[PDB]
């Protein structure tokens, strides 16, 4: 796209022992107007792959359509092989690069989570074709406001539990609500483990303390 119209904000991501948890808020902003207020910016690709995207929302929907058809078609003949978090991460990097090279990019900052083979996966794919891996992620203003807390915690302890990771995620979502002007107070939280992907409905950070 040349100019994004309806955009989302920061997506978070943490990997703990035996799973990956990500989160994002439910809001579509039309350039400083909170136009749509109940949209879902998190996808479930297959039984071990989740995806959350920032930026343009029509681009996110197009990529949802394409990726879903791919997973369907490979699952059709059911020969015993299935796509993986890494295969989907690579496919996405290649498609983003091919779009930037024609000067017609897709305007998202996707995040891939996964859990296959007994160990977790967490990857980052920018619109220009930059891609890497890390034990934590954050896009948009989150890259300035939430990554310091995640790094402060993972410095001391390199491994967390499911409960601690979830607590950390919500503790960061609160500060994003305090300091980001495109943020909203309703968010979803997905989680992938050995049993599959689970998404949780509209949560709130009502743990606010406005002592003015």
Give min distance, CB of 205 to other proteins, in A. 12
- Candidate list 1, 7, 49, 163, residue with the active-site label: 1
Contact present, 188 and 203 (Cβ < 8 Å): yes
- Residues 13/137, Cβ–Cβ less than 8 Å: yes
Binds other proteins by CB under 8 A, chosen from 18, 97, 154, 170: 97
* CB-CB contact of 189 with 21 (8 Å): yes
91 binds other proteins (CB under 8 A): no
Of residues 37, 119, 167, 200, which one binds other proteins by CB under 8 A?
Answer: 37
Size of residue set near other proteins by CB under 8 A: 55
* Residues from 168 through 207 that contact other proteins (CB under 8 A): 171, 175, 178-182
Q: Tell me how many degrees the CA angle 3-49-28 measures, rounded to the nearest 5.
A: 30
Site for other proteins in 38-67 (CB under 8 A): 39, 56-58, 61-62
What do you get for the CA distance between the two ends of the chain, in Å? 43
Q: Quick one: 93 or 191, whose CB is closer to other proteins? A: 93
d(CA 166, CA 168): 5
107-111-114 Cα angle (round to 5): 150
Would you state the structure tokens that stand for residue 13, as one six-digit string?
Answer: 């991501």
Q: Is the CB of 48 or the CB of 127 nearer to other proteins?
A: 127
100-159 residues in contact with other proteins (CB under 8 A) are 100-101, 103, 105, 124, 128-134, 141, 143-149, 151-152
Catalytic status, residue 193? no
Strand order in the sheet with 49-52: 42-46, 49-52, 111-116, 119-125, 131-133
Q: Of 140, 127, 201, 196, whose CA–CA distance to 172 is shortest?
A: 140
Instruction: Pick the stretch among 36-44, 66-74, 77-85, 190-198 that binds other proteins (CB under 8 A).
Output: 36-44
Closest contact distance (angstroms) between CB of 19 and other proteins is: 21
Residue 104 neighbours by CB under 8 Å, 6+ apart: 1
Binding site for other proteins (CB under 8 A): 1-2, 4-6, 29-30, 32-37, 39, 56-58, 61-62, 93, 97, 100-101, 103, 105, 124, 128-134, 141, 143-149, 151-152, 171, 175, 178-182, 208-212
Tell me the catalytic residues.
1
């Amino acid at each position: 796209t040349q100019n994004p119209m309806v955009t989302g904000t920061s997506v978070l991501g943490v990997k703990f022992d035996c799973g990956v948890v990500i989160a994002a808020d439910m809001l579509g902003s039309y350039g400083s107007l909170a136009r749509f207020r109940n949209i879902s910016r998190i996808m479930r690709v297959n039984d071990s792959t989740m995806l959350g995207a920032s930026g343009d929302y029509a681009d996110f929907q197009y990529l949802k359509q394409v990726l879903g058809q791919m997973v369907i078609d490979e699952e059709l003949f059911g020969d015993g092989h299935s796509y993986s978090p890494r295969a989907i991460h690579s496919w996405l990097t290649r498609a983003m690069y091919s779009r930037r090279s024609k000067m017609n990019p897709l305007w998202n900052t996707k995040v891939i989570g996964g859990y296959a083979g007994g160990e977790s996966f967490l990857g980052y794919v920018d619109m220009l074709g930059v891609a890497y891996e890390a034990p934590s992620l954050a896009t948009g203003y989150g890259a300035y406001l939430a990554q310091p807390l995640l790094r402060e915690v993972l410095e001391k302890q390199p491994v967390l539990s499911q409960t601690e990771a979830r607590e950390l995620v919500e503790r960061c979502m609160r500060v994003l609500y305090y300091r980001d002007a495109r943020s909203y107070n309703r968010f979803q939280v997905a989680t992938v483990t050995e049993k599959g992907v689970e998404i949780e409905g509209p949560l709130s950070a009502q743990t606010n303390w406005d002592i003015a």
